[PDB]
Write a protein that binds this ligand. Structure first.
Ligand SMILES: Cc1ncsc1-c1ccc(CNC(=O)[C@@H]2C[C@@H](O)CN2C(=O)[C@@H](NC(=O)C2(F)CC2)C(C)(C)SCCCCCCNC(=O)C[C@@H]2N=C(c3ccc(Cl)cc3)c3c(sc(C)c3C)-n3c(C)nnc32)cc1
Lengths: 98, 91, 150, 110
């Protein structure tokens, strides 16, 4: 079963999919392939919660229902280690009258 | 393999090339007349472009389906800005 | 009188299956090509249907008249039940373009007389007022079959 | 009685014949109330009947004489006449099929 993730750090955001049976380490291998940073130099969080490299994405709580294409699940990313800092997206304006 | 979409307010969105080509505008911007990896949008903010990238993954994922697809959700708040973006991007 | 049901009296046992989150309004094209509304199917529900060979069907959102797919096409025409086996008609959402999907949400929130009071380009006004329509789509499908047969 | 029930099978066999299919087809299988979108058939018609059900009772030897078999064939037609107004196409079909049955059933050995 496929899980659709949104890997985030500062003002960067990576849209990628992964198997539920896939491990947290295999996700660091994808981040490396994109942002050119060995896996030992990165950490992955789920709402201020460190993820072990041995654990699978399913065991971390990312499931088909949680991490969907139209509504992907957020994964925190940090380099070096720096404090986890995800800049929030801009605010939508007030619902226009009508 | 991947492409970078940049919003009006800095935010960078790394997205699979095959996903981003869902947009006629993006397809035209980083193809050739007769090629680039980055595309900057001066007038599309984070909260919109993030939703557009979600649409790309949704569109690529469920065009291949044949049994049942889910609704693509749009919060009333984003509806107006996302329309104008969808018009500009031709998707 | 090009897209119409043939008046065969050859029965066809069908199953309509609503696998959309919308309330579905089935539309039978009668023998003159005029569209007839049938009772609506709630979401996730299915039911047995008595129809006939060469009868044209077409499915819509009961509320908004947004087009829906049936076995990944716009039109459903029953075959003859081989060994009395039912013909399945699986009704689903299409993968709407982000544009057509946004129009739906803006239409569902704004009253038609207030479309003009939205701060958007004149080309998005004319796209909002151009409601999904059965008569509109039938014209398209008629010309698609002309080029397909030629 | 054995020879009369052999006739009945022969009558029913002919009612299923392709030459009569043009007007016999509505009465082949039991009335599917969901498929026909009817919300009242079960209130009005207490004892449903059809040629398929009759064929089973014939092979299962549930008809003691030919007069028990005829009663069920007439019930089938009665149900159709009772439920539908006379102008409905199905009534015209029921009559054309009863014309066939009554003709053959009237030449029953005794
Ligand atoms: C509830 C619902 N929710 C979503 S869709 C739906 C739904 C509701 C009703 C139906 C009923 N089916 C139709 O309306 C079909 C669908 C479409 O293919 C068009 N259609 C027709 O029935 C068309 N008629 C024909 O093609 C023919 F008549 C030329 C052969 C219509 C729309 C032009 S006429 C059908 C509307 C009139 C309904 C009469 C209501 N009465 C009955 O159903 C009584 C029933 N009639 C019939 C009957 C009706 C017509 C014919 Cl010449 C012969 C028998 C009947 C049987 S048994 C059996 C297998 C049938 C078909 N029957 C018996 C015996 N006694 N009564 C009956 C289907 C779906």
């Amino acid at each position: 079963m496929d899980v659709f993730l949104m890997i985030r750090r500062h003002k960067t955001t990576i849209f990628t999919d992964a198997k539920e049976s896939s491990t947290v380490f295999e996700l660091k291998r994808i981040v490396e392939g994109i942002l050119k940073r060995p896996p030992d130099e990165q950490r992955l969080y789920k709402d201020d919660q460190l993820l072990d490299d041995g654990k699978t994405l399913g065991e971390c709580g990312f499931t088909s229902q949680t991490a969907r294409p139209q509504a992907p699940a957020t994964v925190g990313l940090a380099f070096r280690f720096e404090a986890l800092c995800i800049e929030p997206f801009s605010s939508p304006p007030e619902l226009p009258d009508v | 393999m991947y492409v970078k979409l940049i919003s009006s307010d800095g935010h960078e969105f790394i997205v699979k090339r095959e996903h981003a080509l869902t947009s006629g505008t993006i397809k035209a911007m980083l193809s050739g007349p007769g090629e680039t990896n980055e595309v900057n949008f001066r007038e599309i903010p984070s909260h919109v472009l993030s939703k557009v990238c979600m649409y790309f993954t949704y569109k690529v994922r469920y065009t291949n389906s044949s049994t049942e697809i889910p609704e693509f959700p749009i919060a009333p708040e984003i509806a107006l800005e996302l329309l104008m973006a969808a018009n500009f991007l031709d998707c | 009188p090009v897209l119409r049901s043939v008046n065969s009296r050859e029965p066809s046992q069908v199953i309509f299956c609503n696998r959309s989150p919308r309330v579905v309004l089935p539309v039978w094209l009668n023998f003159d090509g005029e569209p007839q509304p049938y009772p609506t199917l709630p979401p996730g529900t299915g039911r047995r249907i008595h129809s006939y060979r060469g009868h044209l069907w077409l499915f819509r959102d009961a509320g908004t008249h947004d087009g829906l797919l049936v076995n990944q096409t716009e039109l459903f025409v029953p075959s003859l039940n081989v060994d009395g086996q039912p013909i399945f008609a699986n009704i689903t959402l299409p993968v709407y373009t982000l544009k057509e999907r946004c129009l739906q949400v803006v239409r569902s929130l704004v009253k038609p007389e207030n479309y003009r009071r939205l701060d958007i380009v004149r080309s998005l006004y004319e796209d909002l007022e151009d409601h999904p329509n059965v008569q509109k789509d039938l014209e398209r499908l008629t010309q698609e079959r002309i080029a397909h047969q030629r | 009685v054995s020879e009369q029930l052999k006739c009945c099978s022969g009558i029913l066999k002919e009612m299923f014949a392709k030459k009569h299919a043009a007007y016999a087809w509505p009465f082949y299988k039991p009335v599917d109330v969901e498929a026909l979108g009817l919300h009242d058939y079960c209130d009005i018609i207490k004892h449903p009947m059809d040629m398929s059900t009759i064929k089973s009772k014939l092979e299962a030897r549930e008809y003691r004489d030919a007069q028990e078999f005829g009663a069920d064939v007439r019930l089938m037609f009665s149900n159709c006449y009772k439920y539908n107004p006379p102008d409905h196409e199905v009534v015209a079909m029921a009559r054309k099929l009863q014309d066939v049955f009554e003709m053959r059933f009237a030449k029953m050995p005794d």
